[PDB]
Design a protein around this motif. Structure first.
Motif, short mmCIF file in Angstrom:
data_model
loop_
_atom_site.label_atom_id
_atom_site.label_comp_id
_atom_site.label_asym_id
_atom_site.label_seq_id
_atom_site.Cartn_x
_atom_site.Cartn_y
_atom_site.Cartn_z
N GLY A 40 0.86 -1.16 0.15
CA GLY A 40 -0.11 0.22 0.18
C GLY A 40 0.70 1.24 0.00
O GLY A 40 1.79 1.16 0.64
N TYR A 41 0.31 2.33 -0.67
CA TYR A 41 1.02 3.57 -0.83
C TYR A 41 0.29 4.75 -0.28
O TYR A 41 -1.05 4.60 -0.29
N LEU A 42 0.74 5.85 0.22
CA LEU A 42 0.19 7.11 0.39
C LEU A 42 0.86 8.10 -0.10
O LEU A 42 2.17 8.16 0.17
N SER A 43 0.14 8.95 -0.98
CA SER A 43 0.81 9.70 -2.00
C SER A 43 0.06 10.84 -2.34
O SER A 43 -0.87 10.65 -2.27
N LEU A 44 0.82 12.02 -2.96
CA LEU A 44 0.18 12.71 -3.88
C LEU A 44 0.00 12.20 -5.18
O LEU A 44 1.15 11.79 -5.37
N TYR A 45 -1.09 12.14 -5.84
CA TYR A 45 -1.37 11.24 -7.08
C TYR A 45 -2.28 11.93 -7.68
O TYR A 45 -3.08 12.61 -7.64
N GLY A 46 -1.78 11.96 -9.15
CA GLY A 46 -2.83 12.43 -10.26
C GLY A 46 -2.51 12.09 -11.72
O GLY A 46 -1.49 11.22 -11.75
N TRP A 47 -2.83 12.73 -12.58
CA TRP A 47 -2.72 12.41 -14.05
C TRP A 47 -2.80 13.82 -14.88
O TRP A 47 -3.59 14.63 -14.23
N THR A 48 -2.11 13.64 -15.91
CA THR A 48 -2.10 14.77 -17.27
C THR A 48 -2.64 13.81 -18.28
O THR A 48 -2.25 12.40 -18.37
N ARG A 49 -3.09 14.48 -19.19
CA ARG A 49 -3.40 14.06 -20.51
C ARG A 49 -2.25 14.78 -21.40
O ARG A 49 -2.11 15.93 -21.13
#
Length: 183
Positions: A63-72
């Motif tokens: 398991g991870y605890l992160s700042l997480y996101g996506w770009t297109r």
């Protein structure tokens, strides 16, 4: 403050997630496949300063605890990992960034025909992974600009179209519990 709630699961195993008041969430999971749960913003910003307090983060396995996101444009999945369970995530080593009182290893990886925000695709991951696990139960800051500008120095340029940006709990073939407040 936060404007967005993420609750995605591949439907393998049991993931029980609660959208509590304000920036708070909780998740209990048993023998999951993959899930991503968290709170943040529907549109990411490279200049956002993110604060969180993980009241609990107890993965049994991965398991991870992160700042997480996506770009297109193009499709990139990014992580700033502050805590992990049994498995510290790695890829190809690019160098290090010091931010918010910690040192992070910077990695890239390619995922070929993998689950994404836009279905089965080939996409790149950008990682900042802390060299030691950050304290749990403390008011923690991530100055995301430091990571973006460190990544830029290595040619790790994000996409032009910004999707969500969250403090996420992610499980893989694990069980666990998390309680997190984001602001």
């Amino acid at each position: 403050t936060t404007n967005y709630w993420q609750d995605w699961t591949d439907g393998v195993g049991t993931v029980n997630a609660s959208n509590l008041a304000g920036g708070q969430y909780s998740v209990s999971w048993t023998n999951c496949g993959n899930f991503v749960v968290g709170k943040g913003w529907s549109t990411g910003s490279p200049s956002r300063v993110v604060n969180y307090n993980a009241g609990a983060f107890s993965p049994n396995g991965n398991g991870y605890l992160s700042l997480y996101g996506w770009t297109r444009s193009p499709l990139i999945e990014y992580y700033v990992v502050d805590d992990w369970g049994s498995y510290r995530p790695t890829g190809t080593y690019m160098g290090t960034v010091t931010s918010d009182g910690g040192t992070y290893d910077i990695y890239t990886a390619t995922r070929v025909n993998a689950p994404s925000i836009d279905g089965t695709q080939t996409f790149t991951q950008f990682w900042s992974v802390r060299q030691s696990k950050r304290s749990i139960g403390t008011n923690n800051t991530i100055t995301f600009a430091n990571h973006v500008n460190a990544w830029k120095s290595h040619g790790m340029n994000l996409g032009s179209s910004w999707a969500y940006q969250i403090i996420a709990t992610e499980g893989y073939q694990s069980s666990g519990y998390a309680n997190v407040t984001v602001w």
